[PDB]
Structures are given as structure tokens and as C-alpha cells.
Design a binder for this molecule. Sequence first.
Ligand SMILES: *[C@@H]1O[C@H](CO)[C@@H](O[C@@H]2O[C@H](CO)[C@@H](O)[C@H](O)[C@H]2NC(C)=O)[C@H](O)[C@H]1NC(C)=O
Lengths: 49, 37
Amino acid sequence: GGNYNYLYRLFRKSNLKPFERDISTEIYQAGSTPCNGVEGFNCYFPLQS
Amino acid sequence: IEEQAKTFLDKFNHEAEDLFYQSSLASWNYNTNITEE
Ligand SMILES: *[C@@H]1O[C@H](CO)[C@@H](O[C@@H]2O[C@H](CO)[C@@H](O)[C@H](O)[C@H]2NC(C)=O)[C@H](O)[C@H]1NC(C)=O
């Protein structure tokens, strides 16, 4: 049925420094636009499973 | 802009591969063992 408890990050502003760690979940940001916390056109969560 | 389309497809390429899997795995269980359930 699928083990959906193992996630990974697939969007970030900039690549990590070595041995750096980032557990935030603040929404992403597509083309120029606000998007005050809410998916939609060009914008969406940063974690997949 | 074009870089917005690349980030659109990556979101697509991850959600589709799992939803196509289960939708084709359930078509296997019907094809090799027929019930109506
Ligand atoms: C066809 O497959 C289904 C499901 O894969 C089988 O139905 C039940 O499967 C569960 C497993 O989750 C068993 O615990 C039940 O005992 C099964 N039902 C019955 C009536 O045995 C079904 O058995 C398969 N078809 C055949 C002919 O074995």
C-alpha cells in the first residue's frame, strides 16, 4: 500500500552548504507573486514522499 | 517564463509516477485473478 512516511525535500532557494541541515516547511515561491501560505499556480509545498 | 514550466513538470513527474503505479497495479490484480471485488 505504500510507506508514505519517508519524505525528501525537492525545492529550495539555494544548494546546501556541506553538512548543513534544513527542516523548515515554509511554502515555496514560483514566478513573481505573493502566495501567502497557499498552494496554487506556481507555488506548492516543498516536501514529497 | 520558461523556468516556471520546469518547476511545474517536476511536481508533475513525482505525483504522476505514483498515481500511475497503483492505477496499473490494480489493473494487474483484476487481470490475473477475476472477481467483481
Ligand atoms: C483474488 O484476490 C483477492 C485479493 O487479492 C483475494 O481475496 C481476499 O484476499 C484477502 C487478502 O487481503 C484474503 O485474506 C481473503 O481470504 C481473500 N478472499 C477469499 C474469499 O479468499 C482472492 O482470494 C483472490 N482470488 C482467489 C480465487 O483466490
